[PDB]
Every structure is written in structure tokens, then in C-alpha cells.
């Protein structure tokens, strides 16, 4: 169903081009969170706000390639980026063309979500090594109404569900305020190499402060951390929601993989590392 890929590109474009407000909930085993995402474009420049609706008034804003983090009690700062991370699932900001060579876009049909008829699409890596996504996108605005992150064997890890939303060809006023606002201050060859990486993953950065490397396939990302110390340093595996942390020791070396990978997949990477 090549339509599937076309539909996903349409959803991406809509998320990038339209002015709109999504009132949604984010669901994981840690609870149900009320959130609000605002997006617009002023003079071909993206404006956006992700606001926590209950409890402390934490918010993340975007303007151009600048991302500001606010949180009462703590102190504001800004980073460079093309979009707010965790304001919408990564699936929305992904470039389906790039991962088309290692991902299958399967149409599941149409169904009603948030009082809208939506196209339902499954995004699965062909090699079966990763979590998969199921998207419910509004057939009219093309915006995502629901997004489920699933484990390789169908276990729902996380849910994004729109409850109310509006599309305005006209720019909000509060977004105009953000348009003029003064945002807070702005803020490598390694030894070993991972012999096995799921199809499509590529290194994007490196660093230290332990030997760490960051990987990403355009949708999911994970870091493979290596340090050679061992107090109680032991073999363990934990999953804080979609985030996995696989730790193992060998050759007097601790191997900690952190990220969006199924436990089995992470473990395999740790073992297939050829030390220098």
C-alpha cells in the first residue's frame, strides 16, 4: 500500500505547515498526563508551545531553531533544534523517505478517533528488531489524533491521544507574543565498535564525562555507554517505559545501552561490541 507512505508524509507536512492546537493526553504505566501543543508559522518560521496542563506550570517553547525550557523553581535555558522533543511522538517529526528502505508502512484501515475518520497506519522496521508505531491520522487536516508505541510482541508501551483540537489558518495571539519574546540564555574517534546494529541505525555523535556513542535510525535513538570500572557493576536490565537500559560486564568492561530498543535487541548490541 504505497498510499501509506504518502499519507505519512502528508501528516508530517501538516504538523510542520499548519497553525493548530492539540489538547492531548500522554499515557504510559507511570500514568495519564494532560498536555497542550500549539503550533504556527510566522514568516516561514515555526512557533510552538508544549504546556503541562495540571500541577506545576512547566512549558517548552520553540521559535526558529531555538528551544526554550521553562519550569518554576528551576532556571530557563535554550537549545538548538528543529522541534520540541517529547511534545509529540518522534513519529511525527520523522522523515519517512529516509527510513523507507528499512521500514514497512502498512495500512490497517480507517476508523473513528476524536470524532474524526482516520487512516490507520503501522510503521514497522523490516528486520523486526524494534518497537513499532500505529498512527491514526485525521483524513481531513492530516494531523495525528492517536499514536501507539508497541513492543515487538504487541505490548503497548505508550499512547498519545488527542482529545480536542482546532486548526486555524489564522495565527493565535499568544503565539504572536512568543514571536516577540526574549528567550532565556543558550547553553570523536573511540576505541571499540559495535559489530551489529539494526538495519538503518547510524552514529550521530560521540562524547565523554565514560565512553558514549549516540545512534539513531531517524525514528528511534539509543546510546551505547562503555566504562571500565566495576564496584558492584553487574548484569542487569530495566525498562522505564519505552526507555530501556541494558547493562552487562565483560573483558573488565561494563556495557550500558540506553534507549528506545527492545531488551533482546539491546543485549545483542552489547555482546557484539568488538573491543579495541
Amino acid at each position: 500500500t504505497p498510499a501509506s507512505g504518502a499519507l505519512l508524509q502528508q501528516m508530517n507536512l501538516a504538523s510542520q505547515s499548519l497553525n493548530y492546537e492539540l489538547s492531548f493526553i500522554s499515557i504510559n504505566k507511570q500514568g495519564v498526563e494532560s498536555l497542550r501543543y500549539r503550533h504556527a508559522r510566522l514568516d516561514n518560521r515555526p512557533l510552538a508551545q508544549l504546556l503541562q496542563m495540571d500541577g506545576p506550570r512547566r512549558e517548552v517553547v520553540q521559535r526558529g531553531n531555538e528551544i526554550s525550557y521553562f519550569e518554576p523553581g528551576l532556571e530557563p535555558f535554550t537549545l538548538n533544534g528543529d522541534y520540541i522533543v517529547d511534545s509529540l511522538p518522534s513519529l511525527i517529526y520523522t522523515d519517512f523517505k529516509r527510513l523507507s528502505p528499512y521500514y514497512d508502512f502498512i495500512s490497517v484501515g480507517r476508523t473513528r478517533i476524536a470524532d474524526r475518520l482516520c487512516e490507520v497506519i503501522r510503521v514497522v522496521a523490516r528486520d523486526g528488531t524494534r518497537y513499532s508505531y500505529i498512527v491514526w491520522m485525521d483524513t481531513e487536516s492530516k494531523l495525528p489524533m492517536r499514536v501507539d508505541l508497541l513492543d515487538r510482541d504487541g505490548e503497548t508501551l505508550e499512547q498519545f491521544r488527542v482529545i480536542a483540537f482546532n486548526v486555524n489558518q489564522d495565527i493565535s495571539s499568544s503565539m504572536q507574543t512568543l514571536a516577540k519574546a526574549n528567550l532565556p540564555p543558550l547553553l570523536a574517534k573511540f576505541s571499540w565498535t559495535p559489530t551489529w546494529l539494526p538495519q538503518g541505525f547510524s552514529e550521530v555523535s560521540s562524547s565523554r564525562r565514560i565512553e558514549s556513542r549516540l545512534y539513531s535510525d531517524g525514528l528511534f535513538s539509543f546510546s551505547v555507554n562503555v566504562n571500565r570500572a566495576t564496584p558492584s557493576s553487574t548484569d542487569q536490565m530495566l525498562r522505564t517505559g519505552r526507555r530501556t537500559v541494558s547493562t552487562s560486564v565483560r573483558d573488565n568492561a561494563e556495557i550500558t545501552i540506553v534507549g528506545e530498543l527492545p531488551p533482546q535487541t539491546a543485549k545483542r548490541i552489547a555482546e557484539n561490541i568488538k573491543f579495541g
Partner: protein
Amino acid sequence: VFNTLPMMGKASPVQRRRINAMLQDYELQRRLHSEQ
């Protein structure tokens, strides 16, 4: 299910202290070195 405010929310600023450390760096790293 009834937990109104999940710890580590979506709008939060970017022995069990070794992992929670590599966990916070992962978050910063995917934001500093994000993509597009």
C-alpha cells in the same frame, strides 16, 4: 491510571545513581544532537 501527574513529564526540563545518570545524559544528547 489515576496518576494525574507522571514523574518525568513531557514538559520537564531535559548505587542506583549510575544508571539514572546515563539516563539523563541520553535525554540531553537526543535533544542537543537531535535531527532534521
